[PDB]
């Protein structure tokens, strides 16, 4: 009725490569990368756009097994980005683009493992 | 018309060329006082061919920003912070009225929303504080409450006192001697006679007080503060 | 020397030519432009004979127009665009308050109802953005929502937040610990200790925030230019050449805000 902002609030458990748990807060309907952007653990200047063509695995996040069966899978190029812009030309089967993952209301308590930030300047 | 704007643009060109020559001459002499951040505000800002006309007996506050085709009547006061803007159409301000602190008047700039309606203000209209009259005509001898939000097309006729915090909807006339308030403007009661006299009494007292300010606000610049600012 | 004298003469000639050409360009416009002239707006003016007695610790923004007998306590501040018009009756602003941006404070002419009193504001009181206070008698440590429209005769008690955008009607008293808002009185809810802590911390935050605005707004021309040049010089850093040269560049103290205002 009153349309509070708190209804579409999604809380996750992003963990830095230093093994520290973080309680991040996002919105339902926007990308997971946007949710990771407010905390600042992912540099906003690197991935300013939300387009798939403008992705080079700089939004790559590692997902636990228990969260991978309740969101749509990699269609054609979500895997291509992983298997192209990586040190090892192989998929992890536990990683997903944070740019393509949209946050749903039921996707609360999700744990995401942000890896070490790769260079993105030029 | 179009030809006048061409000469206005050429005037800008020549004025800026002369200004740049002045800056080069000043800078060649070893002076950089043209780089100050002086507030470039004019209390009677205009456009190409509007040039707001104000009566000499009226009082306008230095913080007031009269812009456009605003016409000011005899004895009316234009207080501090009001943002009277009259670019698109005329904004007639009546004789003996007053526009209080932190008020404003639109002309509904964008022409998309139908036709733009010029703003008309009657005589002895005690416009209230923080009035946001959005291009509505207001007849003489009336009171407008503080925080009112009059919108375009509203005809507030004679003695139509408007309560504080009103949000009278567009194209909704206020009946004579009837108060409208709330969200939105709804009938509350009928105007009484003591308030009828009080409206004109307040108008007269505010006009006299404005005359007093204009007498004291036109004092010379008091160069003591000028020396104080420079010496730091 | 003589070359300097010749260059100064050439500068005078060029200045005169530029001013003449500016005059010609102004004439070609048809004199349809209002000249800029000088800033006639003055803070702390005398209305009839009474001056506003403002304390030394008070921050009054240059855009503000504090006129009439205004008594402002230590530690408080007046922000931009605000108008403390006190022509008729005194406006005793307490110590530690903050009359925020574009706020208006006015006092009735002792005859709005026959028993008019001058406006008074207590201590540690926040008013908010674009509020309208017309004859109120705010007491110490009270919260006023932004855009509030307190009319005459109202008294707000301590810790008695008025909701933003309210229209508190005539002679309406707000009890301590109550939050009143909307066009009518329209009580909402009681106070919470989280909210009292928030009120106190915001009140002290604006006091320890106002001094940087006070200092920046009161810098001389020979000083503001120096700060502008320094800010331009240190706009961006370069660790590469800094390390290669064996040097380190530290920001000047005058370009660093005090740690109390940082999050």
């Amino acid at each position: 009725g009153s349309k509070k902002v708190s209804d579409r609030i999604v809380k996750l458990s992003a963990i830095d490569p230093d093994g520290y748990k973080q309680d991040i807060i996002g919105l339902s309907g926007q990308t997971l990368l946007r949710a990771l952007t407010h905390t600042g653990l992912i540099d906003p200047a690197s991935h300013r756009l939300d387009d798939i063509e403008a992705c080079s695995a700089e939004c790559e996040v590692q997902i636990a097994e228990e969260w991978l069966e309740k969101l749509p899978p990699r269609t054609y190029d979500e895997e291509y980005v992983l298997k192209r812009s990586s040190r090892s030309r192989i998929l992890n089967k536990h990683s997903r683009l944070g740019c393509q993952v949209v946050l749903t209301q039921e996707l609360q308590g999700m744990v995401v493992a942000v890896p070490e930030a790769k260079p993105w300047d030029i | 018309g179009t030809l006048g704007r061409a000469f206005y643009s050429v005037g800008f060109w020549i004025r800026e060329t002369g200004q740049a020559l002045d800056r080069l001459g000043c800078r060649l002499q070893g002076k950089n006082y043209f780089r100050e951040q002086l507030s470039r505000h004019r209390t009677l800002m205009n456009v190409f061919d509007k040039a707001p006309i104000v009566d000499k007996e009226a009082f306008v506050a230095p913080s007031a920003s009269v812009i456009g085709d605003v016409h000011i009547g005899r004895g009316s006061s234009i207080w501090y912070g009001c943002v009277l803007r009259g670019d698109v159409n005329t904004v007639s301000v009546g004789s003996g009225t007053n526009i209080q602190d932190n008020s404003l008047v639109h002309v509904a700039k964008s022409n998309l929303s139908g036709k733009v309606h010029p703003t008309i203000i009657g005589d002895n209209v005690t416009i209230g504080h923080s009035a946001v009259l959005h291009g509505c005509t207001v007849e003489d001898e009336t009171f407008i409450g503080m925080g009112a939000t009059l919108l375009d097309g509203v005809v507030v006729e004679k003695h139509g006192m408007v309560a504080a915090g009103a949000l009278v909807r567009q194209n909704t006339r206020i009946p004579s001697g009837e108060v409208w308030g709330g969200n939105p403007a709804r009938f509350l009661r009928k105007l009484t006679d003591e308030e009828i006299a009080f409206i004109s009494q307040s108008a007269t007292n505010y006009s006299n007080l404005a005359q007093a300010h204009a007498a004291e606000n036109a004092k010379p610049l008091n160069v003591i503060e000028f020396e104080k600012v420079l010496r730091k | 020397g003589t070359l300097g004298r010749a260059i100064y003469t050439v500068g005078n000639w060029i200045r005169g030519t530029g001013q003449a050409l500016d005059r010609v360009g102004s004439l070609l416009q048809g004199s349809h432009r209002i000249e800029e002239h000088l800033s006639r707006h003055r803070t702390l003016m005398n209305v009839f004979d009474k001056s506003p007695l403002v304390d030394k610790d008070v921050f009054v923004a240059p855009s503000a127009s504090v006129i009439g007998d205004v008594q402002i306590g230590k530690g408080s501040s007046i922000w931009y665009g605000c108008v403390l018009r006190g022509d008729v009756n005194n406006i005793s602003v307490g110590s530690g308050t903050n009359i925020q941006d574009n706020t208006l404070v006015h006092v009735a002419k002792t005859n709005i109802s026959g028993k008019v009193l001058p406006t008074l504001i207590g201590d540690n009181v926040t008013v908010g953005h674009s509020a309208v206070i017309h004859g109120c008698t705010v007491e110490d440590d009270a919260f006023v929502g932004m855009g509030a429209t307190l009319l005459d005769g109202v008294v707000v008690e301590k810790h008695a937040m008025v909701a933003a955008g309210s229209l508190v009607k005539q002679n309406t008293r707000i009890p301590s610990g109550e939050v009143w808002g909307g066009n009518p009185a329209k009580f909402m809810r009681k106070l919470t200790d989280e909210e009292i802590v928030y009120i106190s911390q915001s009140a002290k935050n604006y006091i320890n925030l106002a001094q940087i605005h006070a200092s920046e707004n009161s810098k001389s021309f020979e000083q503001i230019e120096v700060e502008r040049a320094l800010r331009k010089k240190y706009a961006r850093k370069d660790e590469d050449y800094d390390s290669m040269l064996g040097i380190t560049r530290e920001t000047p103290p005058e370009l660093i805000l005090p740690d109390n205002v940082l999050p």
Partner: protein, 211 residues
């Protein structure tokens, strides 16, 4: 206890200093964006190209950064502020996207506005409040902190109250309205040239006495 001091100036000769830098923070106003002389830019406000800020606006972001998007206008007498934090838990910086009309006396504070979001007069957007795109907010609207407006839909009233749903014909008039306001702002922009000639008057008035 209150005491006068001679350091007070009863006539600030220089003026208002429209651009107020706070330490390293500087108001980043872009070219071709109209900012009236009465406007006060303080803190870390950023005005983008094609925008316009009208006289009386007191844009200051001394607490958190405030941004104005492309071709988006902030009308006259609009006070915009930012806070350290918001009740919703989101970053408290207020951001105004493209083609957003703010409307006079809109007291924004730590809000968030999506593009094409016409805001009516007397708007009291509070901390953490969000406005989704293609929506219109009627004049006089007030909404408490943590209250959102959904996608294209018309609201108003003293609280955040639904009114009706926008039609397709009327929901495309927002960008045209913002463009028209930008055109009028540009019309004002050409009125005054850079580097005002007040300094000449400074010298003329200073020559009257001393140096």
């Amino acid at each position: 206890q209150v005491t006068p001091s001679p350091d007070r100036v009863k006539w600030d000769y220089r003026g208002q200093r429209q651009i107020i830098p706070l330490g390293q923070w500087l108001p980043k106003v872009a070219v071709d964006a109209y900012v009236a002389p009465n406007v006060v830019l303080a803190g870390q406000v950023t005005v983008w190209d094609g925008s316009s800020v009208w006289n009386g606006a007191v844009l200051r972001g001394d607490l958190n950064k405030i941004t104005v998007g492309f071709c988006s206008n902030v009308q006259e007498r609009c006070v915009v502020h930012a806070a350290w934090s918001s009740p919703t838990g989101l970053p408290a910086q207020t951001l105004i996207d493209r083609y957003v009309t703010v409307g006079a006396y809109s007291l924004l504070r730590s809000c968030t506005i999506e593009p094409e979001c016409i805001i009516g007069q007397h708007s009291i957007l509070m901390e953490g409040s969000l406005v989704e795109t293609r929506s219109i907010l009627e004049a006089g609207s007030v909404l408490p902190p943590g209250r959102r407006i959904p996608s294209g839909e018309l609201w108003g009233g003293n609280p955040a109250r639904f009114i009706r749903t926008l039609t397709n014909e009327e929901t495309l008039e927002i960008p045209k309205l913002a463009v028209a306001i930008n055109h009028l702002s540009g019309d004002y922009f050409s009125e005054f040239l850079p580097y005002s000639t007040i300094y000449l008057e400074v010298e003329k008035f200073k020559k009257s006495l001393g140096i």
